[PDB]
């Protein structure tokens, strides 16, 4: 009962208007060798949405260091985007450095399947994680009533980039997996001959032919991922409403 | 591909699991239980195994929230029973919750779980469904990347809190950088509501569209923070060593 | 390309969300025995649109005396409507008392044919003048670059109400028609017998059997209409920008 | 409902028969560098229609000063057009200098959406304002019972040409706008960078980044537009029926 | 009902994934001059299916001597295939040397008509006997509750190759036919001249013009076929469950 | 390029003409509480088909003991059926007691999927084994060039009836299975709880939780089944062509 | 209804299997310069059909003298054709020299419209008389219960060949027509000029311009046709059943 | 490539205009318990057609004696039918007693498939032999160039009525069949038990179980059929053209 792009598909070709200008997706980011996180929010001048834009802004440098750009999306105009970003800088002291797509007829929202049953007129809290080839790698759909956990979006990109370069799969809760810790998983054998070569070789730690791992990520990569999760877990030292 | 949506009732279906034949969402609604239905590509795969052990380790935390767990893959019930035996034998962890067998992809196609990474194996989908049978949140992870299971606990804990207190939940709750453990009052949608909100003084406000208070118990806040602290902590002892 | 409601049709049935609440059109106004002017603008926080809201607001009591309610429309959210009305009040000192429809997916815009070729996403400056029976009586379509002449909307309603109560047609430029002045037109004969009776009768002033008129409008009726046009023609004594 | 041309589209390509000859629209006017106002009336030998033809003819030199040609339209024959113009000159003393399209099978009517629900057989009082590139700039739909305000058609053309010439938008009720008087509006910024540049420069008067204006119109341009409205507002010195 | 491949057609072109790798059918076997037996079973880790795989494995060299390769099929994954073959080796002491197709979405099952009314999700016990030209020669459909008689599959391929090589048909129950024993049948005359020539000839034994046979099969080919049926008929000396 | 009935479906309702008269399938046999074997052959007066009719006739009492009736089918007329059975009795000394369906337009053959690519005009050697409920239990498709092994048809019915009555599945090559001999298989557990109870009850011999069996068939049932395969494997004592 | 070929159409192109081999119609006879009679019968081993084959055989040399070949058709197999011709030779003492098409799936029957409502499975007694150019010249449909008069098929071919060679039409009951006897008819005039020329010439015997004839057939031609009818009319000397 | 009624179908229901009045087929004849022969001819005032009408007139009493009525058909008008019948009476001295269908738009001809490839406009020489139940029993299609043999139409009806009353089939060339003379055929047995009963009874003369006959037709019935064929074979005593 709702239509979408899929993991492992090219992000659909589209021209969009942002508060920074008109761009083509995913070409604008592919051309720069950047990943992008496209995320949507129901409407400008809404409180949970404001908390998410402030969370992304606080993490903006972390995204840049990973080679990731951010782009938001709502059904509001570019005039509402400029006005809202001014209200956030005025009342919270936080500049939002990244663009927001203006989608008033829902052209982009319907293309991406971002209109769910909680609202006929406002997008859900969608997330498209797109790599530098323009390929959708992960998609999340949060509802109106619940803000995202932005440190998990950082973990997903870091973990994908690590699995892509080291030719590994990434265990549950990496880098704090209960079985193998910061270990990364060797893709399982898919033939009788490969399963025997795996069991015979002694090259990797194994529970069995279908479960092998090693520890090829650098201490810095592991520490960088732990830092995202430690920030998610810690009560902030000071609240931005307190100082403004 | 096409899907169920947030705010829709979970599609009515009979499914075969390794515990028996059940109707969804009827089977969980009748127990007054939320359920998390999650998919994995194939039995006897390593990332999938890590996620089943992560879910099993959090089984009581899910029971504490009134949440039942149900897995899904295209493998048979026979493969499910044999795989759960190998996990118990090689890792020392029992998997208590059922797994759907979906060999022709009937359930996979109905739920939109076949993406472009594999023609034959489901992605790592997550449907978070409340005790009314309504889809509240959906997550799609790929083959190469295991889920963060403590975020699934935080989503349920925060949705139940929101429903219980008529509040919305800020980014990164209960560690929001603006309001901390604060919860948000839904914004006014009329000129009259906007005037009443600003004349009131019941809430902390940045402006008429951004009001919050602190109505969650200490217990609610610390239980949600405990999930994230567990996600962030280096394990004390790796299960591969003490199997 | 692109359909519309037509003159003489019932305004299409629809539920709409405004910054005052949810209403049904045209029922909400029909039930009250009121006319309504539904007008659209491209986007909140745009300057020509701002001048038109301020113009309607200044004319609000003139519309109320005619038994006409006002309702605006754009594809912005209710949050943008509330914010924009606050901005007008703060910067110009003018309260906008009438509701604005929020149409974020363009459902209403598409139903009313308000998406023209100057913008794929923002409505033209459309005007629907709807009588207390819910019937569309007149429609205007102004472009993004040109503000409306709001006094002509008052002249249209006043002249329609006069024509309906007195069973007359209204000449060009009424009440300053260069042939008959404040005169109103008797509908022309449509049969041979009617045309003979019309000319054998001393009831009306006539140029010929097809052009008859009289002067049945009250002095008050005529002065009311002349005041709208005199307001349109006179430089305002003081500009609201000055008083800031 | 019923389909139409839209603001911002090229006027639909068509050959039409007039009481002056066969012409191609919009080509015939485009090749002269002329705007045209194409207007429709229900039927020849009808009195409101006659008042409107006389109104247009009296303002013929005003339209010529703006580089605007006039063309009428009804479902009557070229023969009825010639007889009706003859009758207006004989009984009222006014020559109609401009052509009228003859549309007996409603070919042009249907193409332009001029058949509304008040009459299955006679066009509404439609108005298409078309610039010298052949583009539709404004459309008005008046009913059978109500004559148009022809001085508003002059104000629309004068304002659009000024807007085009000086790269400005025109406020409500120009040149008597209650906020900025005869001032013209600078199109609002559409990007964060444009919004900052606008407010950092002292180049324009501004309420805020989204509302900037200046006064680039000549006193001649302003007073010619005010003259149209002053004429609409004035009690006629002498009624043409008294000069019959 | 439900659709199928037919005797005398080429086996449908398809790429399939096995626990030995990705192959094209029937090309992978045609290119080798090999016959193949493609057989399906409902699910890995099921007992009748296990008895069938061990029966085929025990006859593997008998198939190899005939120039026939074996390939299984079920809707289980390649991982389950490797795990199940390991379990059969561990618990029964029998290695399954031949590949199994993994068909988890039932793409191959549907193409081959292997989903019957006993199970919506698991294939019947289907058997396709395909010659070295890639042509389907024989098809068997056993149900979930009944294991195949694997020696009949050997007799079929043995008898078809003899019939192909010697240009003969094969009587019921060959090589123990109750009328002609190990005799092979000369295809019957299809014209009046062939029927007379056959009866005039004395070249063959005949009951009548439509029933002629001779004994051209080698003693070795007859003894091989009688050995398959002797093996089917005899109670094994030792049961593999006791040996494990 | 062909559809069939499926295993587990009721045999399709049909009226058929035979050389014993008109009968309804499957009702004619269901009403008697009888299984039937419907088998087809390409044409009357053909030699392989004659050998199969003689094999079935010799095994007629064995079918009767199983409560199985036999019914043939070809595209030939009832007249040809009568003449061919007369020819078999005169030249071979074997009376055919069971009916043959006459199917000259291929109505029955098309309904049962019995026209394959080897002949456009003659059926393949199909077999439908139908139980006393009218349900299709097994289907076999042999080609023009290869006679059936009729004793395997007896073994299938015997094993199916045993599996039905004892609630058991039947291993490969039963009653001579190489793992469990004349053992019959307990359907495997389909739940974690059923699996544990199986492993803990000690009620059955097991290789693992998914492979349990016992030996509940009578010595008579086992030896009766074995006798069919012993007959298939025996060099005939004397060939019917000698004693024609 | 049901669909046939038509008089004056080429006999439909088709490959047919006879008890003499595989031939293309009509080419097999066109390339020899021969007419053919294709006739159908419901089923081999039927008594009316047997009388008609014996009648055709008696008249074989009569057909050969006209340059006409015979070809039969039924839905029975080639094997039944051969057995039936053998049974006719053995029991009646008559050899059938001409081929029969075998049509088991009714492919040819359906193409020629030979399946009528007396039988769903067996053809009617159809007759197609086809000339040396492959053109259908006459068609007869007799039913199951009624044998043909084969002497009328000889009269048709003789009369048609005389008509073609002498450029004449043939009267009713030729060569014993009541009005003109063995006379042949000149095609009638189709113009006023031709009608006047016909009546002025005195070339032909005429009743009126539309009925002219002459006597161009030879003694030998007329006697050959009269012999066919005398044979039809003669009570046989001996009955073939009596010498058996 | 042309559609017809079929043997064993009811004659299609239709109202037809004749030169005797408007009638319903087949009802007009069924209600009288009469058979009818409906026959077509290409055109009135054509010579072969004239000979056929005179032949049917000569045989009128013989058809009446069989309870057969005659009805002609052509695409000519009733006025042509009346004129042509008058011309036949005056020039040939023969009164045509039976009606002719007037079918000027080919409505009847198209319904009965009487338009073949020799003429787009004129019907072939069709014959429908219809029994007193309205059922089509035999159909003949002769071409434009060839008159019918009308004595064979009498033989067909006589033999069909004898078959119907005696429950027999009628041999080739009856009543002068070369095997059984004036004998009639017992329909063959269609079951094994009927075949054995037929052979055992000694009730009928038989060649084999499938060919039995007896002599149940009266002396009068046989002599009446023989008279038709003797007439067909007789050289006319005198020619009608001569005595005219």
DSSP letters, chain C, are --EE--TTSBPPPEEEEBSS-EEEETHHHHTTT-EEEEEE-S-TT-HHHHHHHHHHHHTHHHHHHTTEEEEEEESS-HHHHHHHHHHHHHHH-----S-EEE-TT-HHHHHHT---TT-SSS--EEEEEE-TTSBEEEEEEE-TTB---HHHHHHHHHHHHHHHHHT-BB-TTTTSBTTTBT-EEEPPP-SHHHHHHHHH--SSEEEETTEEEE--S-HHHHHHHHHHHHHHHSPPSS-TTT--
Q: How far, in Å, CA of H234 to CA of H58, rounded?
A: 14
Q: How far, in Å, CA of H194 to CA of H210, rounded?
A: 10
Residues 6+ positions from E126 with CB-CB distance below 8 Å: E39, E40, E73, E112, E113, E114, E139, E140, E141, E142
Q: How far, in Å, CA of G82 to CA of F43, rounded?
A: 13
* Optimal mutation site among E59, E118, E149, interface F, most CBs of chain F within 10 A: E149
Chain A residues in contact with E100 by the CB 8 A cut-off are none
CB atoms A91 and B207 under 8 Å? yes
Residue E188 contacts G, CB cutoff 8 Å: yes
Residue A193 contacts E, CB cutoff 8 Å: yes
Residue A78 contacts D, CB cutoff 8 Å: yes
């926080």: which residue's tokens?
C45
């809202």: which residue's tokens?
A84
Q: How far, in Å, CA of F13 to CA of E211, rounded?
A: 36
Chain E residues in contact with G78 by the CB 8 A cut-off are 190-191
- List the one residue out of E89, E87, E86, E55 whose CA is nearest residue E72: E55
- List the one residue out of F187, F183, B79 whose CA is nearest residue E241: F183
The answer to whether residues B4 and B11 touch, using CB atoms and an 8 Å cutoff, is: yes
Q: How far, in Å, CA of H81 to CA of H99, rounded?
A: 9
What would the two tokens of residue H243 be? 């005595």
Query: Could you give the maximum distance between any two Cα atoms of chain F, in Å?
Result: 65
Query: What SS3 string covers E12-65?
Result: CCEEEEECCEEEEECHHHHCCCCEEEEEECCCCCCHHHHHHHHHHHHCHHHHHH
Residues 6+ positions from A201 with CB-CB distance below 8 Å: none
Beta pairing class for D68-74 and D100-102: parallel
Report CA torsion sign: B232, B233, B234, B235: negative
The answer to whether residues C68 and C34 touch, using CB atoms and an 8 Å cutoff, is: yes
Residue F82 contacts H, CB cutoff 8 Å: yes
Interchain touch E–F (≥3 Cβ pairs closer than 8 Å): yes
Q: How far, in Å, CA of G3 to CA of H3, rounded?
A: 4
* Optimal mutation site among E16, E23, E82, E102, interface A, most CBs of chain A within 10 A: E82
Which positions 101-120 of A are in contact with B (Cβ < 8 Å)? 113, 116-118
Whether a cis peptide bond, with omega within 30° of 0, leads into A26 is: yes
Whether a cis peptide bond, with omega within 30° of 0, leads into G175 is: yes
Resolution reading in Å: 1.9
Nearest-CB residue to C173 (from D8, D55, D170):
D55
Query: Per residue in G137-156, is it b (16+ CB within 10 Å) or e — as a string?
Result: bbbbbbbbbbbbbbbbbbbb
| Distances in whole angstroms, Cα of residue C100 to Cα of each of A84, C10, C69, C71 | 20, 21, 12, 6
Whether a cis peptide bond, with omega within 30° of 0, leads into D26 is: yes
- List the one residue out of F159, C41, G131 whose CA is nearest residue E48: F159
Query: In angstroms, what separates the C-alpha of B74 from chain A's closest C-alpha?
Result: 16
Report CA torsion sign: G20, G25, G30, G34: positive
* Optimal mutation site among C78, C88, C97, interface B, most CBs of chain B within 10 A: C78
Q: How far, in Å, CA of H142 to CA of H124, rounded?
A: 6
CB atoms G77 and F120 under 8 Å? no
Provide the angle, in degrees to the nearest 10, between the axes of the packed helices C78-92 and B191-200: 70
Interchain touch B–H (≥3 Cβ pairs closer than 8 Å): no
């604005």: which residue's tokens?
C100
3-state secondary structure of A108: helix
Report CA torsion sign: B72, B74, B77, B78: negative
Residues 6+ positions from C98 with CB-CB distance below 8 Å: C56, C57, C60, C69, C70, C71, C72
Query: In angstroms, what separates the C-alpha of B192 from chain C's closest C-alpha?
Result: 7
Q: How far, in Å, CA of H136 to CA of E223, rounded?
A: 65
Residues 6+ positions from E36 with CB-CB distance below 8 Å: E25, E26, E29, E68, E69, E70, E71, E130
Beta pairing class for B210-213 and B20-24: unpaired
- List the one residue out of E107, G171, B193, A239 whose CA is nearest residue H148: G171
CA-based angle D64:D70:D75, to the nearest 5? 170
Tell me the sheet residues that pair with A141: A126, B138
Residues 6+ positions from A46 with CB-CB distance below 8 Å: B187, B209, C79
Tell me the sheet residues that pair with E142: E125
Q: Residue F200's CB: how many other CB atoms inside 10 A?
A: 9
The answer to whether residues G100 and G66 touch, using CB atoms and an 8 Å cutoff, is: no
Nearest-CB residue to H210 (from F20, F79, F85):
F79
Chain C residues in contact with B195 by the CB 8 A cut-off are none
Q: How far, in Å, CA of C143 to CA of C125, rounded?
A: 6
Which residue does chain D place closest to C10, by CA atoms? D117
CB atoms F45 and E213 under 8 Å? no
What would the two tokens of residue E3 be? 């659709």
Which residue does chain B place closest to F211, by CA atoms? B78
Query: In angstroms, what separates the C-alpha of G17 from chain H's closest C-alpha?
Result: 23
Report CA torsion sign: D175, D180, D186, D188: negative
3-state secondary structure of G103: coil
The structure's method of determination equals X-ray
CB atoms C117 and D6 under 8 Å? yes
The answer to whether residues F109 and F124 touch, using CB atoms and an 8 Å cutoff, is: no
Beta pairing class for F35-40 and F125-130: antiparallel
The strands making up F205-208's β-sheet, listed across from edge to edge, are F184-186, F211-214, F205-208
Q: How far, in Å, CA of A109 to CA of A112, rounded?
A: 5
The answer to whether residues E210 and E189 touch, using CB atoms and an 8 Å cutoff, is: yes
CB atoms F191 and B84 under 8 Å? no
CB atoms G105 and F102 under 8 Å? no
Chain D residues in contact with C124 by the CB 8 A cut-off are 7
Q: Which alpha helices (H) appear in D105-169, and where do they start and end?
A: 107-112, 150-166
DSSP states of H30-79? HTTT-EEEEEE-S-TT-HHHHHHHHHHHHTHHHHHHTTEEEEEEESS-HH
What would the two tokens of residue A187 be? 């893709």
CB atoms D147 and C172 under 8 Å? yes
Nearest-CB residue to E78 (from A190, A193, A209):
A190
Burial bucket for residue B73 (CB in 10 Å: 0-12, 13-18, 19+): buried
Chain E residues in contact with F177 by the CB 8 A cut-off are 51, 55, 147, 236
The answer to whether residues B160 and B136 touch, using CB atoms and an 8 Å cutoff, is: no
* C181 dihedral zone (left: phi>0; alpha: psi -120 to 50; beta): left
What would the two tokens of residue C235 be? 């430089």
């429903």: which residue's tokens?
B163
Report CA torsion sign: G57, G62, G64, G69: negative
The answer to whether residues F36 and F127 touch, using CB atoms and an 8 Å cutoff, is: no
What would the two tokens of residue A4 be? 């979408």
The answer to whether residues F162 and F168 touch, using CB atoms and an 8 Å cutoff, is: yes
What would the two tokens of residue E24 be? 């094209």
* Optimal mutation site among E16, E17, E18, E19, interface A, most CBs of chain A within 10 A: E19
Helix (H) or strand (E) segment spanning residue G39: strand G35-40
Q: How many CA atoms lie within 13 A of H197 on its CB side?
A: 7
Q: How far, in Å, CA of A21 to CA of D191, rounded?
A: 6
Q: How far, in Å, CA of E127 to CA of F142, rounded?
A: 11
Q: What letter does residue G38 receive in the DSSP assignment?
A: E
Residue F88 contacts G, CB cutoff 8 Å: no
Whole-number CA gyration radius for chain C: 20
Residue F210 contacts B, CB cutoff 8 Å: yes
Chain C residues in contact with A46 by the CB 8 A cut-off are 79
Provide the angle, in degrees to the nearest 10, between the axes of the packed helices C219-233 and C150-166: 160
Q: How far, in Å, CA of H75 to CA of B203, rounded?
A: 99
Residue F211 contacts B, CB cutoff 8 Å: no
Chain F residues in contact with B19 by the CB 8 A cut-off are 191-193
Query: In angstroms, what separates the C-alpha of H229 from chain G's closest C-alpha?
Result: 5
Residue F79 contacts H, CB cutoff 8 Å: yes
Burial bucket for residue E43 (CB in 10 Å: 0-12, 13-18, 19+): buried
The answer to whether residues C37 and C71 touch, using CB atoms and an 8 Å cutoff, is: yes
Whether a cis peptide bond, with omega within 30° of 0, leads into F175 is: yes
Q: What letter does residue G11 receive in the DSSP assignment?
A: P
CA A66, distance to chain mean position in Å, is: 11
What would the two tokens of residue A229 be? 């999760």
Q: How many CA atoms lie within 13 A of F219 on its CB side?
A: 0
Tell me the sheet residues that pair with B126: B38, B139
What would the two tokens of residue C32 be? 């009250």
The answer to whether residues A216 and A184 touch, using CB atoms and an 8 Å cutoff, is: yes
């030292």: which residue's tokens?
A237
Burial bucket for residue G204 (CB in 10 Å: 0-12, 13-18, 19+): middle
Report CA torsion sign: C189, C191, C196, C202: negative
Tally of helices (H runs) and strands (E runs) in chain D: 8, 11
Q: Which chains touch E (3 or more CB pairs under 8 A)?
A: A, B, F, G
Q: How far, in Å, CA of H244 to CA of H239, rounded?
A: 9
The answer to whether residues B209 and B187 touch, using CB atoms and an 8 Å cutoff, is: yes
Tell me the sheet residues that pair with D17: D22
Q: How far, in Å, CA of G130 to CA of G112, rounded?
A: 13
What would the two tokens of residue F211 be? 């492979």
Which residue does chain A place closest to C107, by CA atoms? A105
The answer to whether residues B125 and B41 touch, using CB atoms and an 8 Å cutoff, is: no
Domains and CATH numbers, chain E: 1-145 (3.40.30.10), 146-244 (3.30.1020.10)
The answer to whether residues D117 and C6 touch, using CB atoms and an 8 Å cutoff, is: yes
Residues 6+ positions from B9 with CB-CB distance below 8 Å: B25, B132, B133, B134, B135
3-state secondary structure of H93: coil
CB atoms A83 and D210 under 8 Å? yes
Residue B188 contacts C, CB cutoff 8 Å: yes
What would the two tokens of residue H240 be? 């009608």
The answer to whether residues E34 and E67 touch, using CB atoms and an 8 Å cutoff, is: yes
């810095």: which residue's tokens?
A220
CB atoms H173 and G235 under 8 Å? no
Q: How far, in Å, CA of E97 to CA of E85, rounded?
A: 9
Q: How far, in Å, CA of G196 to CA of D115, rounded?
A: 68
CB atoms E190 and G83 under 8 Å? no
Contacts of the segment G52-55: beta carbons below 8 A, 24+ positions apart: G52/G125, G52/G147, G52/G148, G52/G150, G52/H172, G53/G88, G53/G94, G53/G96, G54/G88, G54/G92, G54/G94, G54/G240, G54/H172, G54/H178, G54/H179, G55/G147, G55/G148, G55/G150, G55/H172, G55/H173, G55/H177, G55/H178
The answer to whether residues B146 and A172 touch, using CB atoms and an 8 Å cutoff, is: yes
Q: Which chains touch G (3 or more CB pairs under 8 A)?
A: E, F, H
CB atoms E115 and B105 under 8 Å? no
- List the one residue out of A15, A31, A41 whose CA is nearest residue A144: A41
The answer to whether residues D112 and D5 touch, using CB atoms and an 8 Å cutoff, is: yes
3-state helix, strand, coil in chain B (%, to 5): 35, 25, 40
Helix (H) or strand (E) segment spanning residue F39: strand F35-40
Query: In angstroms, what separates the C-alpha of G18 from chain H's closest C-alpha?
Result: 23
Residues 6+ positions from C178 with CB-CB distance below 8 Å: D54, D55, D58, D236, D239, D240
Q: What letter does residue A228 receive in the DSSP assignment?
A: H
Q: What letter does residue H235 receive in the DSSP assignment?
A: P
Q: How far, in Å, CA of F26 to CA of G151, rounded?
A: 49
CA B15, distance to chain mean position in Å, is: 20
Which positions 7-66 of B are in contact with A (Cβ < 8 Å)? 7-8, 44-47, 49-51, 53-54, 57
């050998």: which residue's tokens?
F51
A217-A219-A220-A223 Cα dihedral, nearest 10 degrees? 100
Q: How far, in Å, CA of A31 to CA of A27, rounded?
A: 6
Query: In angstroms, what separates the C-alpha of E66 from chain G's closest C-alpha?
Result: 35
The answer to whether residues H101 and H15 touch, using CB atoms and an 8 Å cutoff, is: no
Q: Residue H94's CB: how many other CB atoms inside 10 A?
A: 19
DSSP states of B191-229? HHHHHHHHHH-SSEEEETTEEEE--S-HHHHHHHHHHHH
| Distances in whole angstroms, Cα of residue B131 to Cα of each of B10, B22, B67, B136, B152 | 11, 16, 9, 11, 16
Residue F38 φ then ψ, to 5°: -95, 125
Residues 6+ positions from E161 with CB-CB distance below 8 Å: E35, E66, E67
Which residue does chain E place closest to F172, by CA atoms? E147
Residues 6+ positions from E235 with CB-CB distance below 8 Å: F175, F176, F181, F182, F226
């Amino acid at each position: 009962p709702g239509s979408i792009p899929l993991i492992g598909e090219r992000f659909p070709e589209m021209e969009v208007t942002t508060d920074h200008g008109v761009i083509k997706l995913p070409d604008h980011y592919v051309s720069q060798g950047k990943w992008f996180v496209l995320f949507s929010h129901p409407a400008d001048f809404t409180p949970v949405s404001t908390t998410e834009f402030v969370s992304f802004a606080r993490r903006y440098e972390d995204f840049q260091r990973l080679g990731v750009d951010l782009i938001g999306l709502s059904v509001d105009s570019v005039f509402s985007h400029i006005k809202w970003k001014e209200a956030i800088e005025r009342h919270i002291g936080v500049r939002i450095p990244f663009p927001i797509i203006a989608d008033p007829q829902g052209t982009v929202a319907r293309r991406l399947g971002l209109l769910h049953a909680e609202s006929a007129t406002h997008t859900v809290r969608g997330v498209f994680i797109v790599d530098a080839r323009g390929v959708i790698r992960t998609m999340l759909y949060y509802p109106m009533e619940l803000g995202r956990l932005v440190d998990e979006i950082l973990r997903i990109v870091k973990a994908l980039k690590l699995g892509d370069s080291l030719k590994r799969a990434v265990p549950a809760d990496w880098p704090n997996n209960e079985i193998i810790g910061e270990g990364l998983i060797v893709p399982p054998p898919t033939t009788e001959d490969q399963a025997r070569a795996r069991m015979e070789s002694g090259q990797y730690r194994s529970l069995d032919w279908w479960f092998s791992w090693d520890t090829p990520a650098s201490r810095d990569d592991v520490e960088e991922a732990r830092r995202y999760l430690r920030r998610a877990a810690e009560k902030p030292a000071k609240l931005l409403y307190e100082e403004a």
